[PDB]
Tab-separated table of C-alpha atoms in Angstrom:
chain	number	residue	atom	x	y	z
A	1	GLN	CA	83.455	97.225	103.087
A	2	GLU	CA	85.013	100.587	103.929
A	3	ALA	CA	82.338	101.968	101.656
A	4	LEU	CA	79.467	100.767	103.908
A	5	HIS	CA	81.611	101.867	106.813
A	6	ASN	CA	81.653	105.483	105.782
A	7	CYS	CA	78.976	107.167	103.699
A	8	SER	CA	78.308	110.117	105.850
A	9	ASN	CA	81.665	111.976	106.624
A	10	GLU	CA	84.056	114.130	104.756
A	11	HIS	CA	86.254	111.242	103.701
A	12	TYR	CA	83.286	109.733	101.758
A	13	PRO	CA	84.001	111.408	98.355
A	14	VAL	CA	87.754	110.857	98.526
A	15	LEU	CA	87.385	107.112	99.210
A	16	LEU	CA	84.713	107.065	96.530
A	17	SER	CA	87.047	108.638	93.975
A	18	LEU	CA	89.667	106.076	94.848
A	19	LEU	CA	87.253	103.179	94.654
A	20	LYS	CA	85.631	104.156	91.368
A	21	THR	CA	88.987	103.852	89.605
A	22	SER	CA	90.418	101.143	91.758
A	23	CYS	CA	87.966	98.700	90.052
A	24	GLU	CA	88.801	99.576	86.485
A	25	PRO	CA	90.815	96.499	85.545
A	26	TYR	CA	88.266	94.335	87.395
A	27	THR	CA	85.564	95.565	85.041
A	28	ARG	CA	87.753	94.649	82.119
A	29	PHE	CA	88.284	91.119	83.639
A	30	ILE	CA	84.545	90.848	83.790
A	31	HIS	CA	84.301	92.144	80.191
A	32	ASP	CA	86.626	89.340	79.069
A	33	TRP	CA	84.966	86.045	80.052
A	34	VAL	CA	81.491	87.073	78.940
A	35	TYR	CA	82.247	88.491	75.568
A	36	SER	CA	84.967	86.048	74.328
A	37	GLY	CA	85.580	83.765	77.285
A	38	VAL	CA	89.114	85.032	77.304
A	39	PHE	CA	91.225	84.570	80.467
A	40	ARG	CA	93.382	87.460	81.486
A	41	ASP	CA	95.808	87.812	84.434
A	42	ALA	CA	99.323	89.217	84.929
A	43	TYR	CA	100.395	88.917	88.572
A	44	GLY	CA	97.126	87.217	89.638
A	45	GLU	CA	94.260	89.557	90.538
A	46	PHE	CA	91.068	87.857	89.452
A	47	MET	CA	88.549	86.055	91.620
A	48	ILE	CA	87.572	83.427	89.096
A	49	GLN	CA	90.342	81.373	87.295
A	50	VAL	CA	90.830	78.841	84.551
A	51	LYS	CA	88.708	68.572	83.311
A	52	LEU	CA	85.722	66.638	82.065
A	53	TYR	CA	84.516	68.712	79.117
A	54	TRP	CA	85.740	72.161	80.069
A	55	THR	CA	89.050	73.472	81.362
A	56	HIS	CA	87.215	76.200	83.334
A	57	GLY	CA	87.527	76.593	87.098
A	58	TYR	CA	85.652	78.151	89.964
A	59	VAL	CA	86.393	78.790	93.646
A	60	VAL	CA	84.036	93.606	94.308
A	61	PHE	CA	80.994	92.153	92.543
A	62	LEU	CA	78.538	89.992	94.340
A	63	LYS	CA	78.954	86.266	94.140
A	64	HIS	CA	75.401	86.153	92.559
A	65	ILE	CA	77.163	87.504	89.423
A	66	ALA	CA	80.431	85.518	89.930
A	67	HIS	CA	78.916	82.182	89.360
A	68	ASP	CA	76.856	83.668	86.488
A	69	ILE	CA	80.256	84.622	84.883
A	70	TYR	CA	81.588	81.119	85.568
A	71	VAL	CA	78.676	79.558	83.736
A	72	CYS	CA	78.597	82.182	80.906
A	73	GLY	CA	82.261	81.497	80.243
A	74	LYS	CA	81.523	77.812	79.702
A	75	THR	CA	78.534	78.620	77.501
A	76	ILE	CA	80.805	80.913	75.365
A	77	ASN	CA	83.439	78.142	75.269
A	78	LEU	CA	80.775	75.750	73.947
A	79	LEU	CA	79.368	78.291	71.450
A	80	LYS	CA	82.860	78.790	69.983
A	81	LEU	CA	82.496	75.304	68.390
B	1	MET	CA	102.457	140.643	125.672
B	2	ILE	CA	99.911	140.879	122.899
B	3	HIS	CA	101.105	138.592	120.205
B	4	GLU	CA	102.021	135.273	121.983
B	5	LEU	CA	98.587	135.661	123.565
B	6	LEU	CA	97.337	134.872	120.056
B	7	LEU	CA	100.117	132.214	120.010
B	8	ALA	CA	98.816	130.637	123.180
B	9	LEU	CA	95.157	130.768	122.417
B	10	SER	CA	95.700	129.375	118.888
B	11	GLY	CA	96.731	126.054	120.366
B	12	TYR	CA	100.490	126.097	120.429
B	13	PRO	CA	101.304	126.385	124.157
B	14	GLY	CA	103.382	129.168	125.519
B	15	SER	CA	106.451	129.257	127.685
B	16	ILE	CA	104.873	132.028	129.740
B	17	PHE	CA	101.219	130.729	129.821
B	18	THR	CA	101.912	127.259	130.917
B	19	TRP	CA	99.557	124.532	129.674
B	20	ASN	CA	98.553	122.001	132.240
B	21	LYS	CA	95.923	119.350	132.388
B	22	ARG	CA	95.010	120.596	135.911
B	23	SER	CA	95.411	124.317	135.559
B	24	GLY	CA	94.786	124.909	131.841
B	25	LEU	CA	96.897	127.669	130.482
B	26	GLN	CA	98.422	129.729	133.316
B	27	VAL	CA	100.683	132.800	133.604
B	28	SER	CA	103.941	132.272	135.454
B	29	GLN	CA	102.651	134.676	138.158
B	30	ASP	CA	106.025	135.196	139.902
B	31	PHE	CA	107.473	138.133	138.038
B	32	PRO	CA	109.061	140.886	140.257
B	33	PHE	CA	107.223	143.353	137.932
B	34	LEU	CA	103.748	142.031	137.565
B	35	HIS	CA	100.781	144.140	138.731
B	36	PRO	CA	97.380	143.123	140.095
B	37	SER	CA	95.635	144.772	137.142
B	38	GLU	CA	96.899	142.461	134.458
B	39	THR	CA	96.359	139.228	136.468
B	40	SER	CA	92.529	139.221	136.353
B	41	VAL	CA	92.444	140.018	132.628
B	42	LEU	CA	94.889	137.188	131.805
B	43	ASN	CA	92.852	134.853	133.930
B	44	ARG	CA	89.681	135.906	132.099
B	45	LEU	CA	91.362	135.352	128.719
B	46	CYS	CA	92.900	131.946	129.562
B	47	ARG	CA	89.570	130.258	130.106
B	48	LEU	CA	88.537	130.433	126.412
B	49	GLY	CA	91.937	129.013	125.331
B	50	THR	CA	91.709	126.158	127.733
B	51	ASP	CA	88.219	125.249	126.376
B	52	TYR	CA	89.481	125.641	122.811
B	53	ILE	CA	92.388	123.218	123.449
B	54	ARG	CA	89.932	120.700	124.885
B	55	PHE	CA	87.521	121.117	121.948
B	56	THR	CA	90.000	120.893	119.090
B	57	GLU	CA	91.853	118.022	120.834
B	58	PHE	CA	88.665	116.014	121.266
B	59	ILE	CA	87.510	116.652	117.659
B	60	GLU	CA	90.869	115.569	116.279
B	61	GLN	CA	90.825	112.577	118.565
B	62	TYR	CA	87.503	111.094	117.638
B	63	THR	CA	86.865	112.025	113.994
B	64	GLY	CA	88.402	109.852	111.252
B	65	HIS	CA	91.107	108.275	113.398
B	66	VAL	CA	90.491	104.655	112.380
B	67	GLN	CA	89.726	102.429	109.413
B	68	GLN	CA	87.041	100.739	111.524
B	69	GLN	CA	89.446	98.662	113.789
B	70	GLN	CA	81.333	97.161	118.348
B	71	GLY	CA	82.513	100.620	119.279
B	72	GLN	CA	81.543	102.997	122.052
B	73	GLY	CA	78.625	105.383	121.607
B	74	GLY	CA	80.261	108.270	123.440
B	75	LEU	CA	83.850	107.758	122.120
B	76	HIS	CA	83.005	106.545	118.568
B	77	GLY	CA	79.942	106.318	116.330
B	78	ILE	CA	78.844	108.401	113.448
B	79	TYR	CA	76.491	110.678	115.482
B	80	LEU	CA	79.424	111.552	117.724
B	81	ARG	CA	81.718	112.166	114.756
B	82	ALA	CA	79.099	114.435	113.206
B	83	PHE	CA	78.852	116.278	116.479
B	84	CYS	CA	82.518	117.129	116.237
B	85	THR	CA	82.115	118.143	112.651
B	86	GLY	CA	79.402	120.602	113.568
B	87	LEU	CA	81.486	121.871	116.580
B	88	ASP	CA	84.569	122.934	114.653
B	89	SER	CA	82.395	124.896	112.133
B	90	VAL	CA	80.765	126.729	114.997
B	91	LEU	CA	84.268	127.609	116.282
B	92	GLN	CA	85.318	129.299	113.044
B	93	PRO	CA	84.645	133.118	113.706
B	94	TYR	CA	86.868	132.993	116.760
B	95	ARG	CA	89.728	131.987	114.467
B	96	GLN	CA	88.685	134.740	112.121
B	97	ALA	CA	88.677	137.205	114.966
B	98	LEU	CA	92.153	136.359	115.963
B	99	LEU	CA	93.321	136.832	112.355
B	100	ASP	CA	91.712	140.295	112.306
B	101	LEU	CA	93.283	141.214	115.706
B	102	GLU	CA	96.801	140.621	114.444
B	103	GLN	CA	96.292	143.133	111.695
B	104	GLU	CA	94.977	145.589	114.250
B	105	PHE	CA	98.072	145.109	116.401
B	106	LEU	CA	100.364	145.560	113.349
B	107	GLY	CA	98.645	148.755	112.378
B	108	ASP	CA	98.953	150.233	115.913
B	109	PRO	CA	101.995	148.907	117.810
B	110	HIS	CA	101.035	150.488	121.186
B	111	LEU	CA	98.034	148.398	122.357
B	112	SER	CA	97.084	146.762	125.556
B	113	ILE	CA	95.313	143.561	126.557
B	114	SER	CA	92.050	145.123	127.790
B	115	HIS	CA	91.294	146.119	124.235
B	116	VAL	CA	91.499	142.417	123.270
B	117	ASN	CA	89.540	141.174	126.297
B	118	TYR	CA	86.787	143.685	125.386
B	119	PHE	CA	86.524	142.296	121.923
B	120	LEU	CA	86.476	138.738	122.916
B	121	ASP	CA	83.639	139.059	125.379
B	122	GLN	CA	81.052	137.366	123.125
B	123	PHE	CA	82.912	134.000	123.205
B	124	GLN	CA	83.381	134.410	126.956
B	125	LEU	CA	79.776	133.219	127.506
B	126	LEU	CA	79.398	130.841	124.508
B	127	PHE	CA	82.443	128.567	125.154
B	128	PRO	CA	81.659	127.517	128.831
B	129	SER	CA	78.047	126.863	127.975
B	130	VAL	CA	78.731	124.326	125.206
B	131	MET	CA	81.273	122.427	127.336
B	132	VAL	CA	78.687	120.698	129.487
B	133	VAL	CA	76.902	119.133	126.534
B	134	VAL	CA	79.917	117.271	125.288
B	135	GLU	CA	80.829	116.558	128.893
B	136	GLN	CA	77.570	114.824	129.481
B	137	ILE	CA	77.812	112.861	126.201
B	138	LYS	CA	81.369	111.753	127.040
B	139	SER	CA	80.761	110.836	130.639
B	140	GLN	CA	77.369	109.259	130.420
B	141	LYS	CA	78.197	107.015	127.430
B	142	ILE	CA	75.206	108.049	125.347
B	143	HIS	CA	74.658	105.792	122.332
B	144	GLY	CA	72.847	106.340	119.150
B	145	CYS	CA	69.826	108.622	118.680
B	146	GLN	CA	69.727	109.677	122.318
B	147	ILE	CA	72.663	111.911	121.349
B	148	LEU	CA	70.210	113.871	119.169
B	149	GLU	CA	68.007	114.784	122.129
B	150	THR	CA	70.860	115.891	124.391
B	151	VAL	CA	71.885	119.014	122.363
B	152	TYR	CA	68.122	119.356	121.671
B	153	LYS	CA	67.262	119.576	125.370
B	154	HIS	CA	70.143	122.060	125.654
B	155	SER	CA	68.680	124.191	122.885
B	156	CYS	CA	65.901	125.172	125.224
B	157	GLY	CA	67.973	127.867	126.973
B	158	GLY	CA	67.192	131.546	127.542
B	159	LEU	CA	70.357	132.668	125.697
B	160	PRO	CA	69.496	133.118	122.025
B	161	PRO	CA	73.110	133.051	120.772
B	162	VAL	CA	74.093	129.806	122.476
B	163	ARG	CA	70.745	128.243	121.386
B	164	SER	CA	71.325	129.211	117.749
B	165	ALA	CA	74.880	127.980	117.992
B	166	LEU	CA	73.952	124.533	119.259
B	167	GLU	CA	71.128	124.218	116.685
B	168	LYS	CA	73.602	123.966	113.819
B	169	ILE	CA	75.403	121.031	115.394
B	170	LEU	CA	72.070	119.328	115.784
B	171	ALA	CA	71.218	120.140	112.176
B	172	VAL	CA	74.506	118.470	111.115
B	173	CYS	CA	73.683	115.384	113.188
B	174	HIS	CA	70.249	115.040	111.486
B	175	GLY	CA	71.676	114.465	108.022
B	176	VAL	CA	73.477	111.133	108.769
B	177	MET	CA	70.155	109.625	110.076
B	178	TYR	CA	68.406	111.123	107.085
B	179	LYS	CA	71.026	109.391	104.726
B	180	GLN	CA	70.563	106.007	106.293
B	181	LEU	CA	66.769	106.288	106.484
B	182	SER	CA	66.687	107.053	102.756
B	183	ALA	CA	68.007	103.530	102.146
B	184	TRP	CA	66.232	101.461	104.791
B	185	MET	CA	62.793	102.927	104.000
B	186	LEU	CA	62.967	102.793	100.239
B	187	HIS	CA	64.894	99.609	99.622
B	188	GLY	CA	65.042	97.799	102.887
B	189	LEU	CA	68.833	97.760	103.494
B	190	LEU	CA	70.511	100.176	105.900
B	191	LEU	CA	73.968	101.640	105.517
B	192	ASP	CA	74.803	101.936	109.283
B	193	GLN	CA	76.975	99.766	111.534
B	194	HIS	CA	77.070	99.881	115.379
B	195	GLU	CA	74.879	103.011	115.573
B	196	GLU	CA	71.154	102.313	115.546
B	197	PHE	CA	68.273	104.427	114.376
B	198	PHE	CA	65.477	102.353	116.047
B	199	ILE	CA	65.876	99.301	113.876
B	200	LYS	CA	66.114	96.007	115.805
B	201	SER	CA	62.448	88.411	105.895
B	202	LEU	CA	59.970	90.106	108.261
B	203	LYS	CA	62.336	89.170	111.114
B	204	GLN	CA	64.978	91.510	112.795
B	205	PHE	CA	62.819	94.503	111.805
B	206	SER	CA	61.044	95.970	114.831
B	207	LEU	CA	60.845	99.273	116.521
B	208	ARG	CA	63.316	100.110	119.476
B	209	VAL	CA	61.255	102.351	121.636
B	210	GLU	CA	64.088	103.071	124.012
B	211	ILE	CA	66.552	104.606	121.565
B	212	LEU	CA	63.842	106.493	119.726
B	213	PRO	CA	63.905	110.360	120.404
B	214	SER	CA	61.110	112.011	122.270
B	215	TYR	CA	60.320	114.632	119.661
B	216	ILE	CA	59.507	111.937	117.067
B	217	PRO	CA	56.088	110.379	117.874
B	218	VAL	CA	55.263	106.656	117.947
B	219	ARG	CA	52.600	106.755	115.249
B	220	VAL	CA	55.002	107.924	112.490
B	221	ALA	CA	57.585	105.310	113.693
B	222	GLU	CA	55.114	102.516	113.176
B	223	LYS	CA	54.521	103.781	109.595
B	224	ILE	CA	58.328	103.907	108.979
B	225	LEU	CA	58.671	100.307	110.201
B	226	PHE	CA	55.771	99.032	108.047
B	227	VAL	CA	57.260	100.795	104.961
B	228	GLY	CA	60.735	99.297	105.444
B	229	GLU	CA	59.367	95.830	106.217
B	230	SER	CA	57.036	95.907	103.171
B	231	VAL	CA	59.659	96.919	100.577
B	232	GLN	CA	62.142	94.361	102.067
B	233	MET	CA	59.412	91.705	101.776
B	234	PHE	CA	58.356	92.215	98.216
C	1	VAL	CA	71.969	103.030	97.527
C	2	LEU	CA	75.564	102.122	97.044
C	3	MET	CA	75.571	99.017	94.883
C	4	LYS	CA	77.613	97.131	92.335
C	5	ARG	CA	74.330	96.514	90.462
C	6	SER	CA	74.567	99.789	88.558
C	7	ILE	CA	77.240	97.944	86.568
C	8	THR	CA	75.571	94.634	85.810
C	9	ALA	CA	72.638	95.907	83.769
C	10	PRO	CA	74.541	96.374	80.453
C	11	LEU	CA	76.232	92.975	81.071
C	12	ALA	CA	73.436	90.563	82.146
C	13	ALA	CA	71.383	91.743	79.131
C	14	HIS	CA	74.178	90.195	76.966
C	15	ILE	CA	74.561	87.131	79.183
C	16	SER	CA	70.814	86.266	78.797
C	17	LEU	CA	71.099	86.693	75.026
C	18	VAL	CA	74.038	84.315	74.818
C	19	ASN	CA	72.112	81.674	76.872
C	20	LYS	CA	69.043	82.085	74.606
C	21	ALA	CA	71.113	81.712	71.434
C	22	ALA	CA	72.825	78.533	72.845
C	23	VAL	CA	69.522	76.914	73.819
C	24	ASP	CA	68.198	77.777	70.305
C	25	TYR	CA	71.302	76.274	68.751
C	26	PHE	CA	70.527	73.056	70.621
C	27	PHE	CA	66.996	72.758	69.179
C	28	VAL	CA	67.143	73.935	65.603
C	29	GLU	CA	70.535	72.390	64.812
C	30	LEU	CA	71.077	69.343	66.953
C	31	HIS	CA	67.435	68.208	67.264
C	32	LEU	CA	67.464	67.305	70.942
C	33	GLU	CA	63.672	67.097	71.124
C	34	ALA	CA	63.715	64.286	68.644
C	35	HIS	CA	66.350	62.286	70.489
């Protein structure tokens, strides 16, 4: 939200250079649940987390993709069978 | 006498030329060995330094001093910040001139103040002129695009150097509006908070006539509005 | 525009393929339409 706050001053590329690498593990986290359904956390830094059929849970990227990741994880967890 | 004048004008206040908020920089004026000749020249020189202190202080105060906590149009806002960014770049050759002058004093150790005051006569008119623009913005609480006209109405003067000087600050202030307009017109989402550029789906998109500058006609503004509304709708 | 949707395009293309393969696995293997 700082990014929408500043797009037209001299601190725009510095904050951009910080933000472009500050999301690098987050992209890995997204690359986990889609491609293998694998959960990954160390100290707890992931928006989605791990009942009746599935043991998957639900509560940066838009939420329009967050629920898509939540359902694509369950589809992978079914296709593993 | 020569070299702390550079020290004082540079913005680190002197123990001889006393910085006050009500007398600016001011010579002690009680020496038992001052002469009436030097008095007038020091008085002429200290005006530019007072204005420079005010300018640099204001620019440092209101550019990039928060992480965003609406704000105030004359004390915050992206147009105002861009005004300061143009303003310090306009002030650059003064700093370069002082840097040159020290080399001159080093090369010739016997030099007097009138030589300096003669060289700095071109800022002597430029610095008092530009003060009233930022003074009017600060006092009158001008918000949004009406800032853009204010230096624009003050780029109608009969002094070519001051006019050309203010035009660059206006040119810097155009680009931020350009940057947000590139997003609202072509996608339908704007990138600006608290500062408006005449934006009030198909709801909460109408033209604010009051904030719209005078040198932009209404016919084009209707087309801009229709374009942004259309791309947002489909 | 600044967006996080310049990332999703090589990802959602795989998501859709997974969904299509699962729906196909329903029909041609488990015969849901007969049921």
